[model samples]
Target: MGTYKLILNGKTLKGETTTEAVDAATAEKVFKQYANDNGVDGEWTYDDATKTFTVTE
Candidate 1:
């Protein structure tokens, strides 16, 4: 298992979040779920070196 970060790059609200998963694919899966639950949406790219998911608005 590995660790990851979720960076939200919205038009106005930007933030960095964290979580752990086996890899980038799985991380994005859960990240989408979490995003919907919070009523937010954007496009994201996975960068595992820092294990980052950049959610862009």
Candidate 2:
């Protein structure tokens, strides 16, 4: 199982989540759901080595 990390970015606000799934890409979608659902619109950035999805806000 590939473990993934999520970062909701901002100077004033931030958030995070950890996901263990089939692959890193899957976790990105998981993060997207949380962020996008609440109208925190942004693109997800991939951390090639660290397996992190950073939300650009």
lDDT of 2 by residue, 1-57 (tens): 578888888555678878886866567678788777655656668876977888877
Supply the global lDDT for candidate 2.
Answer: 0.74
TM-score for each candidate, following the candidate numbering? 0.74, 0.74
Off by over 4 Å in 1: none
Model 2, position 36: C-alpha lDDT score: 72
Model 1 CA lDDT for position 45:
77
Please provide, for model 1 over 1-57, each residue's C-alpha lDDT reduced to its tens digit, 9 standing for 90 to 100: 688888777776776768888867788888877765655578877775777788787
Stretch of 10 with least lDDT, candidate 2 = 35-44
